[PDB]
Every structure is written in structure tokens, then in C-alpha cells.
């Protein structure tokens, strides 16, 4: 059930909310359950395998069970980098932002919870990481 530390180098995480998929993919999450991440990305969607099956689960809803990594540790810099909206979406909440297909913006912080913080026309808010792409520097 629990051997000595060594050949065990997985990313264990613990959930804290009842998330039942969403679309024709992902995986079911029950508060208290642990997931052994197999693959991870920046889109905010994580790939983890459970005692049964694997899939995609929300990192935000997730909560490190003991993973020494404790998820990527970015730095919220007001400097940020310019990003261009690659998807059409309208703000549904005060925190979230509102952008169209091509409405550039200035990121203020990039997190693994998916919904990134984007300041469009001096309006920092929440907008999916994937919903926009990078387009700064040289």
C-alpha cells in the first residue's frame, strides 16, 4: 500500500470540490480523491490518472496532496506581456473580462488555473489562457 521512497516520482494531488466533467471529455472529481498527474499543460487543464481511469481535471479545483513541486510557481508582474484574444467571449462576471476575435490585451498575471488575468484597455480581468495567445517581445 505504501513502499519506501524511491521509484515513486509521480505528481499526487488532492481535490476539494465536486467537479463532474463538463463536456464530452475530462474526468469526474470527488472531494477527497487523489489524482496521479500523468501529463500537464498551461491551458489550465491537467491530465491525471485515477485508480480507475484518467482524463482532464481542473487544476484550480485541485489542491496538491503532497507533490513536492506544489505546481508551477509563477510571478504576478504588472509588467506582463501583450496577448491577443484568439477566441470570442463576453464577460459574464465582474472579475472576468470581455474580448472578441482579435482584441489585443495586456496580461498582468499568468496562472495554471486556466482563466488568466488580462488587462484590456486598462481593464484587468479573467479570461481563459487558451482563449488568447502570446504576441509580445521580438
Amino acid at each position: 500500500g505504501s513502499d519506501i521512497t524511491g521509484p515513486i516520482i509521480l505528481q499526487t494531488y488532492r481535490a476539494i470540490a465536486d467537479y463532474e466533467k463538463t463536456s464530452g471529455s475530462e474526468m469526474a472529481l470527488s472531494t477527497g480523491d487523489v489524482v496521479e498527474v500523468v501529463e500537464k499543460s498551461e491551458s489550465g487543464w491537467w491530465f491525471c490518472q485515477m485508480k480507475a481511469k484518467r482524463g482532464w481535471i481542473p487544476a484550480s479545483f485541485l489542491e496538491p496532496l503532497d507533490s513536492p513541486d506544489e505546481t508551477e510557481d509563477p510571478e504576478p508582474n504588472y509588467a506582463g506581456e501583450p496577448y491577443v484574444a484568439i477566441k470570442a467571449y463576453t464577460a459574464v462576471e465582474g472579475d472576468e473580462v470581455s474580448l472578441l476575435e482579435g482584441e489585443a490585451v495586456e496580461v498582468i498575471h499568468k496562472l495554471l488555473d486556466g482563466w488568466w488575468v488580462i488587462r484590456k484597455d486598462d481593464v484587468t480581468g479573467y479570461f481563459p489562457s487558451m482563449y488568447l495567445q502570446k504576441s509580445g517581445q521580438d
Binding site: 476539494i16 463538463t22 463536456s23 487543464w45 484550480s60 489542491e63 488555473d113 481563459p128
Partner: peptide
Amino acid sequence: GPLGSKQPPSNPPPRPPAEARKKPS
């Protein structure tokens, strides 16, 4: 049938839970 890598869902993950924010701990 390996065609590349594990593609991500077509819909972003739901916002974090209130219990998680109100209580970071």
C-alpha cells in the same frame, strides 16, 4: 493510435471554489 499528444478540452475549467479562495490556508 498515437497521433501526437493528449489534446486539451474544448472548454476551460470552471473557476476555483469559494472555500478555496475565502480560506487559502
